[PDB]
Design a protein around this ligand. Structure first.
Ligand code: NA
Length: 330
C-alpha cells in the first residue's frame, strides 16, 4: 500500500503545515501537524476543556462506530517550545492520503496549552519520530508510520514541504518526479528517538564550505533551523544590521536586507536554503525589525533541522531495519 497527502502552510510565514487526516467511521477529517520530532498522534476532541477550544475541528469518538476506549491509558506531552497537552486514548481507524491503519492510538486531548488553543488552524499532531518517544502510559503506543510500515510497498515516508506553497507527504514510495539529481542517504541514530543525523558542514552565501560535523534532528514540527552559536553568528555577520536580541528572543535583521543563502552538507552533497526562506517577517506588525529563520540551538541541547532547512529538500525518512535519511535538491 501507499498514501499521498498534500500539506499546506497554516499562514503566510510557513509557521507550520497541516495535512488532512481521516479518523473514525464515518470519517472525521482533522487537519494535523505532521511532526517528525515527536511520536504521539493527538487531537482536539469532544473531551477537550471547552475554554481551551477556539475554532479547531474536534474528534468525537462517540460518533465513530470503530472507536474504542483504550482503557486506563493516558498521555501527556511537553514540546521544545514550552507547549503541552494531555488526555486519554482511543483506538480507531486512521487514514492519510488513502493509506489506512486500523487500531491506531488516537490520543484525545482533555487539556491543551494556550499556544494550541490560540492556533485555530491546527487540530492536533501526528508524530513521525520513533515510537520509543510515545508518551502513552502504561502501554506505549506505536506511531501511524510504525503501524503502517509492514503494509507499505517500501518502509519509507517522504516530506516535500513547500516554500509559501503546498507540498506533499508520501508513505510507502519515492516519487522520482519530485526531486532533481540523486538522493544522498546518511546514517541515523535512533538513540534519542529522533531522526538524528550528522551534517558534514555549511556555507554562508557564496562563501567557502566549512567541513564540520553538526549532529541534529530532522524535525518537520519545528519552524526554524537551530544550529550551534558559531555557525549562526557566521551567518548573521553577513547581514548588515543583524543582531541577537535578548528582548525578542533571537537574531533579528533589518527588513530592508537581502539575506544570503545557507548551504548544509549531506555527505558530499549540498542543500542550498535560499535567503528568502530565512525571512520570518516583522517581529510585530508594522516593525522594520524582522525575525531570522536561522537561530542558535544553545540552551536547547540539540540542533534542529526544522522546516526552514527541510523545505529546501526532498527528504526521505527510511524506516528500514537500519533507518537512514535521504536528501535531494528539488
Ligand atoms: Na516567533
Amino acid at each position: 500500500s501507499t498514501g499521498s497527502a498534500t500539506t499546506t502552510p497554516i499562514d503566510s510565514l510557513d509557521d507550520a503545515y497541516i495535512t488532512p487526516v481521516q479518523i473514525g467511521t464515518p470519517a472525521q477529517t482533522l487537519n494535523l501537524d505532521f511532526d517528525t520530532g515527536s511520536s504521539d498522534l493527538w487531537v482536539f476532541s469532544s473531551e477537550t476543556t471547552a475554554s481551551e477550544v477556539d475554532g479547531q475541528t474536534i474528534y468525537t469518538p462517540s460518533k465513530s462506530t470503530t472507536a474504542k476506549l483504550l482503557s486506563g491509558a493516558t498521555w501527556s506531552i511537553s514540546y521544545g517550545d514550552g507547549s503541552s497537552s494531555s488526555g486519554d486514548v482511543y483506538t480507531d481507524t486512521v487514514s492519510v492520503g488513502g493509506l489506512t491503519v486500523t487500531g491506531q492510538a488516537v490520543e484525545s486531548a482533555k487539556k491543551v496549552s494556550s499556544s494550541f488553543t490560540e492556533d485555530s488552524t491546527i487540530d492536533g499532531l501526528l508524530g513521525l519520530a520513533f515510537s520509543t518517544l510515545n508518551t502513552v502510559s502504561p502501554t506505549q503506543q506505536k506511531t501511524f508510520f510504525d503501524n503502517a510500515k509492514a503494509s507499505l510497498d517500501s518502509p519509507v515516508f517522504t516530506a516535500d514541504l513547500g516554500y509559501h506553497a503546498p507540498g506533499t507527504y508520501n508513505f510507502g514510495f519515492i516519487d522520482t518526479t519530485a526531486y532533481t539529481g540523486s538522493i544522498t542517504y546518511t546514517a541515523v541514530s535512533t538513540k534519542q528517538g529522533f531522526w538524528e543525523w550528522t551534517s558534514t558542514g555549511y556555507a554562508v552565501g557564496s562563501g567557502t564550505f566549512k567541513s564540520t560535523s553538526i549532529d541534529g534532528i530532522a524535525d518537520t514540527g519545528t519552524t526554524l533551523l537551530y544550529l550551534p552559536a558559531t555557525v549562526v553568528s557566521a551567518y548573521w555577520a553577513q547581514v548588515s544590521g543583524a543582531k541577537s536580541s535578548s528582548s525578542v528572543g533571537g537574531y533579528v535583521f533589518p527588513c530592508s536586507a537581502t539575506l544570503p543563502s545557507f548551504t548544509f552538507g549531506v555527505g558530499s552533497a549540498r542543500i542550498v536554503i535560499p535567503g528568502d526562506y530565512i525571512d520570518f517577517g516583522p517581529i510585530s506588525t508594522g516593525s522594520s525589525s524582522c525575525f531570522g529563520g536561522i537561530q542558535s540551538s544553545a540552551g536547547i541541547g540539540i540542533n534542529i533541522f526544522g522546516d526552514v532547512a527541510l523545505k529546501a529538500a526532498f527528504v526521505v525518512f527510511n524506516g528500514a531495519t537500519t533507518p537512514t535519511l535521504g536528501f535531494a535538491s528539488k
